[PDB]
Design a protein around this ligand. Structure first.
Ligand code: HDD
Ligand code: HDD
Ligand SMILES: [Ca+2]
Ligand SMILES: [Ca+2]
Ligand SMILES: [Ca+2]
Ligand SMILES: [Ca+2]
Lengths: 675, 675
């Protein structure tokens, strides 16, 4: 581990107190064998006090998440655009830690809630820790940090009864969205498949804000951070996500943990869009506005390096729960912009760690420590782990020979604000009029999805808005949707029994942009780690032989195979009782098992066929291997000539066809469209 | 009341700071219109500091839960058995607050996880706050409080990756259960329908421990607390509970909130079993052992009074999240026993509130305050809300005339330890040999369930143990189950492909006890609040007329009716998109809607039929109203002669039959049994 010096080994030895005294911990000290417990039982109290105090406050947002360690490797010397030391040489490696998350749910809510997702990355650089605290969607709901508690209160559970958990599907959230039209862009992303990603590994990361790269000469450029997934993009379908939220609330954290342990650690190209300072207002919107993307057509990506996650934590609480990210963790070569959302975040993340840690020395926790020396005059505070030798911790001093020395642009590789930055004007609590177009980019995004994706987005809105009780809120929602697309407002209105307002075409257009569609991003670049369920039976030795031969051929290509049957035994991983279509990316029935697809105390009535039908309905590749397919496919009402439906006698031919299906990932012709 | 004095109304007025200065909170103060945010923006920082610090640590256990206010009313003057003031007169009323919970899951986890459930009741008595901090299961996993962190660490998520959430279905939990055989009794309860109750209202509450009732003369008797539900007992089936965990993680808190708002606030008879001190060891087990029940046949229940919950909280965080229960909140007339589980609890609950509240003045929060004056020499600490006038807070004093006075058995209605209590022997960390029978009572419990209930319990163990990776742990589990029942171990072993160990009949017997079976507890005594889904269509004016006439007749009898259709409109509550069988206790299809049961952009393929089939498979009353009937029942493969299947042309006859079905609640003949 990068954190090996802090590890504690309990694989041998006798139980001790926290101060090394050998003890026991299984029976209380009592006044007689059936007597009361004694106050002098220090073994009891130290153990129970620790237990009683194990919990800390969950993060105010992004409470539900999971993390891993890895490495970042630079592809080049990037001194031509940034002074940043971690980017200063081809092949230069820096340790990282990444945490992924949802936003709204509390820390035991479901991974597969519909939500924006966090993607937070720490680079433990040789010039200090640098954090990029990003999301899987490139734009944010609001244009000023001061509005964050309004947004978050509205999407979190109603505060009288704390209902509903981890969901925007309630009156307050849609009230906020409909009254605060800045929200439209992020709303459209959340209501697309980007709100229900297949895994953390199958989503991109974005810094959201425009930042600055600063060279050692003082010149600056504007950048956006883009982490492009090397696993490809993929989503769940909503009905699948809902079932998975109940069957496996830990789906995304399990997926990441398993990928790392199998040696399939996920990778991203860490990229930037780079533009000149003079282009802040050149693209038809303001680069200080975090509700806006720069279309790839206007500014192409530059690949800076490779991020790879390849080591799981030892202790979740100590590493994942305690990691404390800050946009204020910045290094020389990077600087902020006057994005009023970013500006306020700088305050929040330093302050909130006091709540979580309960004390000011949270940067001393192993996961938060830097990998280089600390020289400063910060002292004392609860939980102080350092023993400082310098007894003159003030500047300016002569009694410690003027150390530590000041670092700045010209000495000590100091951080420095980009020297060409200026401010001019009144001290104002006013919104820039350059931020006022809330609807054109939502429309750009919607235009850029495929017809079936558009249907899914409409369906997500129909689902959530149908659960809003207030007729006034629902009308207000249609008013805002209508400014993005009259068609969206018409199709959503049909579900909730309202009339859509008349078209208002001020912000309508037909422009599209590349790289935002999931369905459109073509077949996955790899099928390693994807999950194949083989449905078999113990009633036929030949079904288990078919299952074993399929397993060998699928495992050869790095697929994760689960053989399912009525009961466990050698070669069977899971029972029908525990199995669900949400556990697989493709489902194969071996034709020896055909009789299960027409009752048993060992699983719920119809379970084997339900797994197959659910997989088909949710767009997954499905098939029958062995050559006799009719009985299964007729029971399922699955047509044999369907796209992403397979039937072959030959195991080799079956797997070759099926693997193409897995790369296709989803067969979208199985979903009905509005007329 | 301390609650009413601290209520804050924001239905009018201008925004202020926390010190009453009128402000704004929508735009940050900036150095020019596109400039950086200023440090002097106090409006920004106060708002965000508050947001940053909103969270507090969740409870170490029972983190997921919900609460309500109500009243306890005594049925009699109970002076003849206890000095307790809240029980001292017929009709005497005391305010209560109750919180219900699961045990293992974090905040945000699903209500319908399989778990033990908390049932914690605060009586705000005229002689101080009295808490009975109970569960819905009458026995606990362990016999000594010092083991609690062992139990809890084993059932909570594995600490390297924090998987899995809110579940015992993992190796560590079953390792603990198999190595600590005290766990068998509670394990059997949790694996029965008691682990997945239909609602908080449909479960009982238990103090678990033997306590003492103490009279003003100093004599004592041993008691067990039993809160008997007046709503009846009911459970979910596992497959339903899993789906509901995903479709509605807030199911139990919603059910409670809704019942209270409709004027159907839940009721319990608060009862005790009362036995003499001399019977501590008379029933074949030790009354100090919290893994044991007293069979009703050995000691019948005395009804002390009525508990009714009838008012929802105003603010969840302030009331439900902050309520801080303690078994140390005891009143004169009650005393502890030397149960080593109870003994340690007394320490834990005082200590843990320091973690949650962050300071020592947690009893000053309105929900925790008493309803009588506080006179003591406790002073200072963080968050001190009182201004104490007594400037000589020490005893003994003359400078405050010797006040406050000491209270005890003889003066001031003081609490006093039961004066007959003694202790004798060595100071020991040893377990009493009277606690060593871990298996007979698990067997008593199993024997007392119906055949189908026994099958559900076996099925729950087959499900969970099949997910254990370690073959050695699975074998160890069978070893322990085998000591309860060879048949259980045989039936469980069949699912996980192991052999059961040979019968070991040391603890086997055929005794039964009344009142532990859910299936056996007869029809529900009321059907008010139960949920009827009517599946209709907007295609047919006659389908909506059928739905509306059914609605009128069902709503008359206090049922919560939802009409489901493709889209909302007058008379339709929910779309097929958001509807699920988990949302209903009974499902009716109107005849006019027959065509939906043979594709649409408005809901997933087969959703209407799936709701009906799911409802049937999970044992619910189902029917078709209109008198075509055959087409829908044939499509569903639901037999018309089936118990809990209704088929009538007449709406009146349909409802009369259907309502008996709702009282029956579950039709258990639809579940397969081991040979
Ligand atoms: C002014 C308040 C505020 C605003 C405007 C934002 N956030 Fe934030 N964010 C917080 C206040 C905050 C916080 C309260 O300070 C959190 C909670 C825990 C922590 O360490 O910081 C947080 C956590 C947090 C995490 C979890 C980091 C982790 O896994 O531990 C992510 C990924 C983000 N945020 C991402 C964003 C993005 C991409 C934003 C807009 C572009 C954003 N936040 C705006
Ligand atoms: C020695 C530690 C220990 C032991 C043996 C137990 N508990 Fe406990 N219990 C806790 C330590 C604890 C705790 C850590 O102190 C909690 C967490 C939050 C709090 O207020 O106390 C708690 C919370 C808690 C709650 C939630 C209260 C609420 O709604 O806020 C209930 C209902 C119970 N417990 C019930 C039981 C029952 C019926 C037990 C055995 C008969 C039991 N506990 C044993
Ligand atoms: Ca709401
Ligand atoms: Ca999609
Ligand atoms: Ca485990
Ligand atoms: Ca006393």
């Amino acid at each position: 581990s990068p954190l090996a010096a802090y590890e504690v080994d309990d694989s041998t030895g006798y139980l001790t107190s926290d101060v090394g005294g050998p003890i026991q911990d299984q029976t209380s000290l009592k006044a007689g064998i059936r007597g009361p417990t004694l106050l002098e039982d220090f073994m009891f109290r130290q153990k129970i006090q620790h237990f009683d105090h194990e919990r800390v406050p969950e993060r105010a947002v992004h409470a539900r998440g999971a993390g891993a360690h890895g490495t970042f490797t630079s592809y080049a010397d990037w001194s031509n655009i940034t002074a940043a030391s971690f980017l200063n040489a081809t092949g230069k490696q820096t340790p990282v830690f990444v945490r992924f998350s949802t936003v709204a749910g509390s820390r035991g809510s479901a991974d597969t809630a519909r939500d924006v997702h966090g993607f937070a990355t720490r680079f433990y650089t040789d010039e200090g820790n640098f954090d990029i605290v990003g999301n899987n969607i490139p734009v944010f709901f609001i244009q000023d940090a001061i509005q964050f508690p309004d947004l978050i209160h509205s999407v979190k559970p109603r505060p009288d009864n704390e209902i509903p958990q981890a969901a925007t599907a309630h009156d307050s959230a849609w009230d906020f969205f409909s009254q605060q039209p800045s929200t439209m862009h992020t709303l459209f992303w959340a209501m697309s498949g980007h709100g229900i990603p297949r895994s953390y590994r199958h989503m991109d990361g974005f810094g959201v804000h425009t930042f600055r790269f600063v060279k050692d000469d003082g010149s600056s450029k504007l950048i956006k951070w883009w982490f492009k997934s090397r696993q490809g993009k993929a989503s769940l379908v909503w009905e699948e996500a809902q079932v998975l939220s109940g069957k496996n609330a830990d789906f995304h954290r399990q997926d990441l943990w398993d990928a790392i342990e199998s040696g399939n650690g996920p990778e991203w190209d860490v990229c930037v869009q780079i533009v000149d300072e003079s282009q802040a207002q050149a693209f038809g919107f303001d680069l200080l506005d975090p509700t806006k993307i720069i279309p790839e057509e206007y500014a192409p990506l530059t690949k800076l390096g490779l991020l790879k996650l390849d080591r799981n934590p030892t202790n979740y609480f100590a590493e994942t729960e305690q990691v404390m990210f800050q946009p204020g963790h910045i290094v020389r070569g990077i600087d902020f912009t006057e994005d009023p959302l970013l500006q306020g975040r700088l305050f929040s993340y330093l302050d909130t760690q006091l709540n979580r840690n309960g004390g000011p020395n949270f940067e001393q926790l192993p996961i938060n420590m830097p990998r280089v020396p600390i020289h400063n005059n910060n002292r004392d505070g609860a939980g102080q782990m350092f023993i400082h030798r310098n007894k003159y911790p003030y500047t300016p001093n002569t009694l410690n020979s003027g150390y530590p020395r000041q670092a700045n642009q010209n000495a000590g590789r100091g951080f420095f604000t980009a020297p060409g930055r200026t401010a001019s004007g009144a001290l104002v609590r006013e919104v820039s009029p350059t931020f006022n177009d809330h609807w054109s980019q939502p429309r750009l995004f919607f235009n850029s999805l495929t017809p079936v994706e558009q249907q899914f987005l409409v369906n997500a809105m129909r689902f959530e808005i149908s659960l809003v009780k207030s007729e006034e809120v629902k009308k207000n929602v249609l008013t805002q949707l209508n400014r993005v697309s009259h068609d969206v407002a018409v199709r959503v209105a049909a579900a909730i029994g309202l009339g859509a307002p008349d078209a208002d075409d001020t912000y309508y257009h037909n422009n599209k942009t590349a790289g935002v569609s999931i369905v459109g991003s073509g077949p996955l670049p790899t099928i390693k780690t994807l999950r194949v369920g083989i449905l078999a039976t113990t009633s036929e030795s030949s079904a288990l032989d078919q299952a074993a031969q399929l397993r060998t051929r699928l495992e050869k290509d790095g697929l994760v195979v689960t053989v399912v049957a009525e009961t466990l035994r050698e070669g069977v991983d899971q029972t029908y009782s525990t199995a669900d279509a949400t556990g697989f990316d493709g489902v194969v029935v071996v034709d020896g098992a055909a009789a299960l697809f027409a009752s048993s105390p060992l699983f719920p009535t119809g379970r084997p066929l339900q797994i197959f039908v659910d997989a088909y309905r949710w767009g997954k590749p499905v098939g029958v291997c062995g050559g006799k397919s009719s009985e299964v496919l007729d029971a399922a009402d699955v047509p044999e000539d369907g796209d992403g439906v397979y039937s072959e006698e030959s195991v080799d031919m079956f797997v070759e066809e099926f693997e193409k299906g897995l790369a296709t990932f989803r067969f979208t012709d199985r979903f009905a469209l509005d007329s």
